[PDB]
Design a protein around this ligand. Structure first.
Ligand SMILES: C[C@H]1O[C@H](O[C@H]2[C@H](O)[C@@H](O)[C@@H](O[C@H]3[C@H](O)[C@@H](O)[C@@H](O[C@H]4[C@H](O)[C@@H](O)[C@@H](O)O[C@@H]4CO)O[C@@H]3CO)O[C@@H]2CO)[C@H](O)[C@H](O)[C@@H]1N[C@H]1CC(CO)[C@H](O)[C@@H](O)[C@@H]1O
Length: 388
């Protein structure tokens, strides 16, 4: 017996949201006495919007699309219903383990996995071919390629997103670095790899291998890539359908994807994604648990992939020929398998702001790579009282 309102806050983007609204409302097919109230909440506003509503117990959603780092955020302050022993969890073991870790806080389950993702190098196949260059495997190989692209086509090699701190991580990993050593509770972002990573990004822009912008970075990146102003960008699966809307990439075939470039030490890309959580103060808990089970079901994950090319969290879904034979998926799944995990801690979400500020100042020339790394480390030690 399910009935009543289930308000769902979805953070998915302009290209994704019609699909997600349809899936959400599809819950009513099997439960016609439930009224699904779909609301799209912009990614940048959603964390604060949810905390505001939950903290005041006023107009909070029943079900929240919850970024991997937000689960511990929200859970630690009491805003999420624990899900262990509820109908929200069905065939839990099916989910990728690294997806499952992000749902956990202090020995309890506060979310169900929805999608998993990572960053990759997207490229314009026809531009690279016209430039006579191969997809670059390293930063060194990207610089050489960018020069040939400018010389032969007039395009810039890379749009380097300059306003979102997540985009720093591939460069950090490529220089042999990482934010923290979790096992040893030690801040590591200010090791020499951090200095090198800030220096690499500045060199890419100064050398004109890359362009960037200090604001409106998502739109600027997409516009530059779709208009052929650049040959390459670093982005994730949430960009695929948006890109394919463009005249340049209808022929889905013209859209190349490859790993993010190696740096001087190695190569890596971060693990991200989205889970589904239930507000602790929901006045329709049964219907919400069922809604979460439905939205995380193999059937719905498969449909999401078919319409959007977003990656399922369920292992079984990869065995469905329709998913197993998808080319964006065929690339992204192995890349996700290799993606770097982060500490799933209450202050994990706040590790990004320090990077954002220092990265902006490095790109504008206000701050040296050396100072930026030290500043980032200083901010982490302030955030993480039991880290050295
Ligand atoms: C600073 C923020 O730090 C963190 O976020 C990390 C995040 O943990 C990383 O994993 C990564 O997330 C990936 C994501 O995994 C990936 O899927 C994709 O998301 C797509 C969707 O796919 C697409 O469907 C649609 O939704 O659109 C999504 C976006 O395209 O890309 C994400 C990266 O963009 O990177 C984030 C850092 O960016 C915090 O969580 C904060 O919320 C914080 N926000 C601040 C906002 C404030 C402003 O006043 C205010 O000052 C600050 O205090 C606020 O806190």
């Amino acid at each position: 017996e399910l009935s009543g309102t289930v308000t769902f806050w979805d953070t998915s983007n302009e290209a994704e949201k019609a699909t997600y609204q349809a899936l959400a409302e599809g819950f009513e097919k099997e439960h016609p006495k439930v009224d699904v109230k779909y609301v799209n909440v912009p990614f940048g506003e959603a964390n604060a919007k949810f905390k505001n509503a939950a903290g005041g117990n006023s107009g909070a959603p029943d079900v929240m699309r919850t970024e991997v780092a937000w689960v511990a955020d929200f859970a630690s302050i009491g805003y999420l219903a624990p899900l262990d022993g509820t109908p929200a969890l069905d065939d839990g073991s099916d989910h990728l383990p690294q997806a499952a870790a992000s749902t956990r806080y202090e020995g309890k389950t506060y979310a169900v996995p929805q999608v998993i993702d990572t960053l990759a190098l997207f490229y314009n196949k026809e531009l690279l071919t016209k430039a006579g260059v191969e997809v670059p495997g390293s930063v060194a190989e990207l610089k050489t390629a960018a020069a040939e692209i400018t010389e032969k086509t007039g395009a810039t090699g890379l749009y380097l997103r300059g306003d979102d701190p997540y985009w720093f991580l591939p460069y950090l990993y490529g220089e042999g670095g990482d934010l923290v050593d979790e096992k040893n509770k030690t801040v590591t972002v200010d090791d020499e790899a951090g200095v090198r990573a800030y220096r690499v990004i500045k060199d890419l822009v100064d050398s004109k291998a890359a362009i960037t912008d200090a604001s409106d970075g998502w739109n600027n990146m997409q516009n530059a890539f779709k208009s052929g102003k650049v040959a390459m960008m670093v982005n994730g699966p949430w960009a695929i359908e948006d890109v394919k809307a463009g005249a340049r990439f209808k022929d889905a075939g013209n859209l190349g994807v490859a790993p993010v470039p190696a740096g001087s030490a190695g190569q890596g890309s971060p693990q991200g994604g989205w889970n589904l959580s239930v507000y602790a103060g929901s006045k329709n808990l049964d219907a919400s648990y069922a809604f979460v089970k439905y939205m995380s079901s193999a059937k719905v994950q498969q449909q999401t992939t078919e319409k959007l090319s977003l990656l399922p969290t369920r292992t079984s879904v990869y065995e469905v020929p329709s998913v197993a034979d998808n080319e964006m998926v065929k690339f992204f799944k192995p890349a996700v398998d290799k993606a770097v995990e982060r500490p799933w801690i209450a202050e994990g979400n706040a590790l990004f702001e320090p990077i954002r500020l220092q990265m902006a100042n490095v790109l504008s020339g206000e701050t040296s790579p050396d100072e930026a790394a030290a500043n980032t480390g200083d901010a982490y030690r302030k955030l993480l009282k039991d880290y050295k």
